[PDB]
């Protein structure tokens, strides 16, 4: 998190807002509802209260505007600038303006008025932008998903550095961005994409370019809005430019940011039985045309080139890959080595000598 220079903050806990005008994109009640919900994100974790006035001057004046709308900071039409807000203070301070050239919804489409508003109000209360990509106060918008909204840990720590905690946090466990340098880190899925490593953890992925030591951290929704936050497994088809992504019994095929026609498919179409609930890990080999699909303590080998499961699967991981334990969290390969992730360790496996040759921490893939 970051706070404002001179640490601008309100000197009172009892704050008033007023909705000066309304977007036509939603009904007054729906808009009153979004803003109320936006103020509660902050009131739930602080001593702050928010009271709505119907006339006069409030601390937080809320308005919708298009292009030049009064202050000399004009909006820009569809997309781009979504809204803006002033830090705590008289007059303009604490105020928030929304670009009505956006289509404001209470849904996943357009731009979600509650989501932008919560962010805006963070400014109104004294939070600057955050560098944490998982943080509400991140400078760039992402629709967070269809599940109920939890305010991320960074924003909570930020806001509480100004105002302290409330009496009762209704949701005390706040989502924390994963720490690449934590030796207990375990991974959800790994793949390549255009040369670069993709490492999935919760609702994030790091992308790591081989000429780089520091991995870029992304929200998975920022690449693929129509995919799950958390994923089970991932593999690639280098030539073809294709990523495959698993979550429960569904899988996607992805060509950059595009979900191919006819996905998601059911993993049964891949020829898995009904009692397989998830693919825990997966890896594809370019030269042979075969994919490995892990689940529980077993492996399937699928032939991508003839679209059938190879004969004599499933087999046991214990039997084909001795010495890596009983499960496979995530798996990728390079230069004739397969890297098996199992909790906080990774087993480097030699296809060549058919044995483990090096054992190293999982998070070691992130130059930690």
């Amino acid at each position: 998190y970051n706070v404002f220079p001179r640490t601008l903050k309100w000197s009172k806990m009892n704050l008033t807002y007023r909705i000066v005008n309304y977007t036509p994109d939603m009904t007054h009640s729906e808009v009153e509802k979004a803003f109320k919900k936006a103020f509660k994100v902050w009131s739930d974790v602080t001593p702050l209260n928010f009271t709505r006035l119907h006339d006069g001057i409030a601390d937080i004046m809320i308005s919708f505007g298009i292009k030049e709308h009064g202050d000399f900071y004009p909006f820009d039409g569809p997309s781009g600038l979504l809204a803006h807000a002033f830090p705590p203070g008289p007059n303009y301070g604490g105020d928030a303006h929304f670009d009505d050239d956006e289509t404001w919804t209470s849904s996943s489409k357009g731009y979600n008025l509650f989501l932008v508003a919560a962010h805006a109000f963070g400014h109104s209360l004294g939070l600057d932008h955050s560098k944490d990509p998982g943080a509400l106060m991140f400078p760039i918008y992402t629709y967070t998903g269809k599940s109920h909204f939890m305010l991320p840990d960074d924003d909570v720590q930020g806001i509480q550095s100004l105002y302290g905690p409330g009496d009762e946090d209704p949701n005390p466990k706040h989502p924390k961005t994963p720490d690449k340098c934590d030796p207990s880190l375990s991974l959800d899925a790994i793949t390549s994409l255009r040369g670069e490593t993709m490492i999935f953890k919760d609702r994030f992925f790091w992308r790591l370019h081989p000429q780089q030591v520091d991995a870029e951290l992304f929200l998975t929704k920022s690449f693929w809005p129509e995919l799950p936050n958390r994923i089970d497994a991932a593999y690639e088809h280098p030539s073809h430019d294709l990523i495959f992504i698993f979550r429960g019994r569904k899988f996607w095929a992805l060509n950059g940011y595009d979900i191919l026609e006819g996905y998601p498919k059911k993993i049964s179409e891949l020829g898995l039985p009904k009692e397989v609930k998830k693919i825990s890990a997966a890896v594809h080999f370019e030269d042979t045309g075969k994919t490995l699909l892990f689940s529980g303590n077993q492996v399937w080998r699928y032939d991508d080139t003839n679209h059938i499961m190879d004969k004599d699967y499933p087999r046991l991981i214990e039997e084909d890959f001795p010495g890596i334990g009983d499960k496979v969290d995530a798996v990728y390969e390079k230069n004739g080595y397969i890297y098996f992730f199992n909790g906080p360790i990774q087993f480097e496996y030699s296809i060549w000598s058919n044995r483990i040759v090096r054992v190293m921490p999982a998070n070691s893939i992130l130059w930690c």
């Binding site: 404002f4 997309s79 781009g80 979504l82 962010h119």
Partner: peptide, 19 residues
């Protein structure tokens, strides 16, 4: 004077999404 008042108007913050 009003050095102290303008302070909020500098730190105006926008929220962005690319086109």
């Amino acid at each position: 004077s009003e050095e102290d008042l303008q302070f909020a108007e500098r730190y105006l913050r926008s929220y962005y999404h690319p086109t």
